[PDB]
């Protein structure tokens, strides 16, 4: 008697894997992304439609 | 002799170089050359004709 593993009881629908011990696709929180785009990639308005 | 001309600023950035394009719709009497010029100091024209 050991109860179901974390594969079946982890909140947010995490997938529990081993080697290495990890959780996957936990639908909690948000990742704040920060982009640094150099000025070269910004073309002119006349070039785009 | 020019007639029915309208200027649209389809692009402008106040940069040191020629950072602006003006498109003029024209209905001229005949083909030829115009001495395009801005009497005011608001803008500097890349082309004198």
Residues in chain A: 49
| Method used experimentally | cryo-EM
Structure tokens at A47: 């070039």
CA-wise closest residue to B46 among B36, B10, B12: B36
Say whether residue A45 is in contact with chain B using an 8 A CB cutoff: yes
DSSP string for residues in B27-48: --SS--------SSSS---S--
Cis peptide bond prior to A20, omega within 30° of 0: yes
**Mutate which of A39, A42, A43, A46 to test chain B, going by most B C-beta atoms within 10 A?**
A46
Q: Tell me if A39 sits within 8 A of A32, measured CB to CB.
A: no
Contacts of B2 (CB under 8 A, 6+ apart): B26, B27, B28, B29, B34
Q: Note whether A39 and A27 are within 8 A (CB).
A: no
Q: How far is A41 from chain B (nearest CA, A)?
A: 16
**Which value in Å is the resolution of this experimental model?**
4.0
Judge: A44–B10 Cβ closer than 8 Å, yes or no.
Answer: no
3-class SS of residue B8: strand
């Amino acid at each position: 008697d050991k109860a179901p593993s974390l594969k079946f009881t982890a909140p947010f629908g995490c997938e529990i894997y081993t080697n290495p011990i990890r959780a996957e696709n936990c639908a909690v929180g948000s990742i704040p992304l920060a982009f640094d785009i150099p000025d070269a990639l910004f073309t002119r308005v006349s070039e785009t439609p | 002799t020019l007639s029915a001309a309208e200027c649209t600023l389809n692009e402008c950035v106040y940069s040191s170089d020629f950072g602006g394009i003006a498109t003029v719709k024209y209905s001229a009497s005949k083909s030829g050359k115009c001495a395009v010029h801005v009497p005011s100091g608001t803008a500097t024209l890349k082309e004198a004709a």
